[PDB]
DNA sequence: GAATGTGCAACAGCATGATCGCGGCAAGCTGCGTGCAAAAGTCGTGCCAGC
RNA sequence: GCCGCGA
């Protein structure tokens, strides 16, 4: 109960010291959840194809009274499973069927219908499906799609950093960013002027668009400003009192309250005077005339005598204007605030900038602005203003955009119209005014609450919506001329645009790349990858330094360590272990609630915005039995910082120490002891290791190996396993327990392991079973381990005995010295699978035909070809051996006498047919694994193809006979029980078949009911068995509907074993890497007193400068683990009693300092104890978690337990001279990884090959026989050396001298070593290009 | 390159291949190091006609 | 920052490539006064490091007047530098490339001994490319 | 301006051909509209279109937007395709790719001399194929070129012998990818090794900025007599010891070697042997190897120095000096003419570089090359002997 | 008379002329009556403008 | 006391941003039509020369 | 050309 059936095989000694609250999630939930919400049905229109259909459908013709009313949709069953689809090289997808009906309405009767044709579902498009692991098998490829991280649509305020005009004036701007549509920008000029950049056009004042909303200038001033009223009656010219307004001002004259002096002229301005004035209730008071001179009138008062009026808004007043308004009877005059203490002069300045004061004028002005083309006719302007903004279809904010809008402007409601309204622009303009006024602050662009993450499902949704819009565009046109006879197939379905768009997105896109296939770790880290690039993202060059830094909000959401190094540092990230996605699309991380002083187990997921308010505790905070904090003072993070708070002020608690670290960096033990950059290097390099011949568990790990291995889908996990019935190297058959079962037909579980199969990186994928026979297997158990996995535990390297010491300079710099035993034991030996393809297809003169017989080829090359012209399986090919014999017919219809006698002396063809046969490319060798001949339907099947189909049939019937055998056994048991119930003949009844003629009839009830029903069950079971077997038979042998030109395809797979060698690249998982320098014999390597030599020799100098202390700690701890394993092995050698071995195992497991590991052998079976002790005889595979791992004291006491030195260093003797080294050397066991950088793919040499017709220079790179480019810098170095002749030979006679090359070759073959230079063709090409312009360039004499 | 070519075209100037980059582009011996000896002898021939 | 260093190296190489030693000795009397570099109160560069491998444009007079230590137009090396530092000399007049006075190149005397070898630089050495590479080789390690 | 090929006999027209054919189409339609006495408006528009097409062809992206092909990318014109990055970077002006060139991962060889480098014999026999053909034709093994080619492909033993004969003293120049200064490309004498990785002498790595953690380097064959002399006299590693930036020796021992000498030249208050008086440095080595004395023991040794005060001559002086066993052992590799006080220190990466500089300035070039090689040998050997290790 | 034409720019395939009227090395610099193709080393495709 | 040019500052457009390698995809496929003379090529047909 | 990778 405490441990499942996989764990009792081998238990990792956890060091822990901190209990876990929430277990690690599925580790691949983002992709699966995204596609499930994209695919699965929805009763509402939240998301998915249903939501897209709601967005597009229904559609109707323009007043044509014809509409397309659809109901529901359905995805078809794929015709091929993942295995067959991958083998054949086609895309794994499903057909899409949709039900829609014609409704034709009455033209004479309004809102009346005459026809309703409810046609059945129609097919359109083929939607690729995601596998169970998170990959899209398209074109026989894996193609994982990376999640994108971009700017969330909404409102963003920016400060520009305040250095644009060098005057120190900080410019605050606002950006309106939609999910789909045109952007908007509100900018502030240095003269404090509103400007609007719409769709990134030229700068335009905001007053035009403000008036375009049917807003008058007086109304605009009233809305955007606070108005005051000045009363001038009987020449008193009183002023209203607003005490909160006048904060900074100079009293130009005496200010009296109700005839009593309140504030003198130029008196005190302190808050005491303002408070005293406010305390005294005073009505309006008179003011000096000169004060009102600077005021600006807001409204437009009308003269009662004549129609003439002072309508000049945003203007001052004159002394004669006072008399003019007094004559007109203007007792009260409305003037704007005119106050500059916190507010400022805005809006009115822009209105003074532009004189357009009409909606028509604003519309025509913006029409001429965005579009310099034809002027409008009162209709183009209105239509464009409707289409650009506040449009249902042309412009659309997403729901996340609306919620960000509401949050940014402090609005109670969250839901709302997906479009922007009139008050919206007013609100954002007011907020932009306020932020310059002082209230509010600018937000952070790189805040993780302002960055959204879109997954595969959302992108596929957008692509499908685009395709649906494209289809509807012509669906509308088709309905115009459609009669009643038209059905949906003939109603312009247009599946082609939908399929083309979907395939273009899924196959050829920026964020759909080849999945890495080195170890399961690379697949895991690639599937949960976060890319800042993409269609809607930012280009590499558009990124700055701030975008590539670690924002303090990256704590529990984005890994700070794992990221690419050179060009893409900071632009690509990995999700943290516990990080998930919010409903709107923002990253959340879990935390534990804190109530009073006790930390409860309840968990809340907090996003970037939410977690900035609460005070979050630390994972490394000690707790009590009841959960209370041991210390009254605890370190915490409050608002982007780190401080120390009381135990009562803590709001949330970090769930675990791994929360900050992603999957890739979680497998680095003692990560906290390594430098951050070296840790990054190690995390990057862990994903490049290749699986070896035999997986080897890490003697020191972090406990995340099991989760990574199981959650990657690389292994085989028992879905509902019971007890194992049959184990094979390629099949596992499990009989499910009777406690849980599906009623009727019983059933068993069959797993078909994938044998040696080429990966994406040409590595090998293999699966080997872990269960032997009759082993009880629980649900979720591990049956078979994939490449680089041991007993369901991730294992992508090998444990090696390592000594840190300089050895004759053979480990100089980062070089590695490796003993010969490493090569002997086939460690670090890998299998690489390569696929070769040859295709037959028709041409001008006939069919390209594949045969063993090939003209003008000796019998030596035909020894390895069968009677159909293919290699024997398992034949060892090397060099340019012939794989498949393909002959291409040539053309000749004029049999000249020479050709006649040629055909007479030789065969009828007389070798007229040319050969184009697949030969192994040079430098490629190995054994042939499989052949996958594919044939076109109608043509004669290949001879080897018949054997392939026979093998497929035999496998199908063999794997199908088990359930039928079980079912007939059950029926026979039931019949036997029935016959024992009455008229039992004992063994004689079992002697005669067919239940001894159904035991005659016996009783009437048994004959009429029991025997008849049993016979009926037998008959229908046999009929169903025959039907399903025949269906599978017909399915397997079906002619392929292949490509047109292609008639036949054959594919050959080659396997080669790549053994370790000096130049190869090997590295650990702490960022230490190197290239081997020498393979040392056993006798030459250092050995200890016991005489066992070390395996790897490493340079100590790499440690103190790189700060990789995890290297030394891991070596010491692996030495301790291997010492424990050696003790267990020695005790097993003498076959002592199980009790004392159990006691030693118990004592070893309980070692530690308050470790949360409660493994006990008292409840452990004796045979189970024996098996466990036999499993870890190599070494005790302990596990130290990332940020709470083993301490030095624990490691030293573990070393003491295993009878090893406490310091971790032993006396080493030189293997060649036998002399002891003066200082002790730290010998340990370190997990080394063989990276995918091998010299067999990095060794190139060319003397003379192919060139390009342009510039006549040699081609570039390997796989093309290219030469090493001599760039500008090396030529500069040649000039600096003064080596002019070497430079001349490197510029002319080596690259671009068409005759110089041949002359040099002839001279060297002769043995002259003469230059004879010439004129490079590149300069002649340049001259021709320049002359091809209007420029004449020539060579003088 | 656009700016330099226009000014060079209208002026009708000549390069004369006196520096290192010009001789590298053409492919002759650069007037430095071992190629200095060859370039000096050629100059006297041009001077002497 | 590697791109910013490589661009500077490209510009320096381009601007300095057309410079080779074409003359043995121009015979100019111009030069540069050279003193140990001191910022405030501490010594940051002694005279020996700065003046080593350079040709004196003028005789250096010891504190004793009318006393000639090393004549004009001579190459300074380790022995001469040690003899000079033995006395109390502070400033030395040393000819430089900016005052070579020669046309289309630099004199072999105005340019001191090449830093690669102990001997004086010989005619035909492309000094511009060497100088540009020497200046631009760092920068990848400059902390910006 | 070749047009691209692809599946079938179809040929996809290129960018330059697209611009040229657009110009021809516009010109043909405009010239045919001239003879029809068409209204001035259409002829005006067609002339404008022809002018725009010509401007796009000659320099795409000027005076308007840049026209695009099938994809949404600019159709690069004559100006954009002058040579690579609009100048002469790519196919001209030091942009040429060259043959007789190899490339592979570099490892360390501590047995190599300063002028030697390890070359794979599989990389060879390819870079030196014409020379092998010439030697095969010269020695009568193959009369015709076809026979020599076939027997080189078959790779017989005599082919390997002739490759060894050809390689004997033909220098080959190695360079690393980011060639910063002139010392980033250096000539070496190749020695054939049975592998696939280039073995590089450690002392030059500091000049190459090269470390053995995955670095790769390229090989070029100076296949000319003048080129061979230039590689031997101007490019050889033994030739450039002082860097042409400050004059300090760029070839200096580092890493293990510095640890090898530093551990050797150290003193301990008590060790095996105190105050022993020994006649020569040979006896110090004898005692250290026999195990009767320690490297850090303080002893008095009778040591003879050579001095160069005599004009072009060396004088020998013998004296009893108090030193350690390690310094006495190290004294056996230094050349004559250097004072003993050059090794009576700790030798912390600054005294050894100073001693190399003094050896160059006082003796010459061959003695300091041999001295550097011996220093690197003894540093590696005694670093291995010391067994230095880093623990927790 | 197109961008890729054989009457100018030289022949397409070695010393062979279009229509096969004069396709030998014996003929040199001869204009065929049927087509203006002349017999040349077919490298003049790099030189004729 | 009003009038007329020289300096000047903000502004829009152009040019540039390290080197050398390795591995995978996905495309990129481009333009008539016309009716007749004028020519050339072809097919059904009959011919002589060899066995 | 994109994408990923090595120094
Ligand atoms: Mg490196
Ligand atoms: Zn001079
Ligand atoms: Zn012709």
Author numbering:
A (entry chain C): 1 to 1341
B (entry chain D): 1328 to 1376
C (entry chain D): 789 to 932
D (entry chain D): 250 to 641
E (entry chain D): 54 to 102
What did the article's authors report about this structure?
Transcription initiation in bacteria involves the recruitment of RNAP by sigma factors (σ) to promoter regions located upstream from the transcription start site (TSS, position +1). In approximately 60% of bacteria, a major variant σ factor, σ54, forms a class of its own, lacking structural and sequence similarity to σ70. In σ54-mediated transcription initiation, σ54 recruits RNAP to genes responsible for regulating a variety of stress responses, including nutrient depletion, membrane stress, antibiotic exposure, and biofilm formation. In this study, we used single-particle cryo-electron microscopy (cryoEM) to determine the structures of initial transcribing complexes of increasing RNA lengths from 5 nt to 9 nt, which allow us to propose a mechanism of RNAP promoter escape in the σ54 system.
However, at 7 nt RNA, the RII-finger adapts a different conformation, to accommodate for the growing DNA–RNA hybrid and prevent steric clashes. The tip of the RII-finger is coiled backward by 9.5 Å, as measured from the Cα atoms of the tip of the RII-finger (Middle). In RPitc-7nt, the folded back RII tip is stabilized by interactions between Y112 of RII and V253 of β′, P110 with the DNA–RNA bases (Right). In addition, P110 and Y112, observed in 5 to 7nt complexes, were also not resolved, indicating that these interactions are no longer stably maintained. These results suggest that the folded-back conformation of the RII-finger observed in 7 nt complex is stabilized by specific hydrophobic interactions and therefore likely represents a kinetic barrier during initial transcription. Taken together, data presented here suggest that RNA extension to 7 nt causes the folding back of the RII-finger, which is stabilized by specific interactions between RNA, DNA, and RII-finger. In RPitc-6nt and RPitc-7nt, the template strand (at −5 and −6 positions) is scrunched around the RII-finger and σ54 ELH, while the nontemplate strand scrunches around the ELH, resulting in poorly defined density. From 7 nt, ELH and upstream DNA become more flexible, indicating a global conformational change occurring within the transcription complex. In σ54, we observe RII-finger folding back when RNA length reaches 7 nt to accommodate the increasing DNA–RNA hybrid.
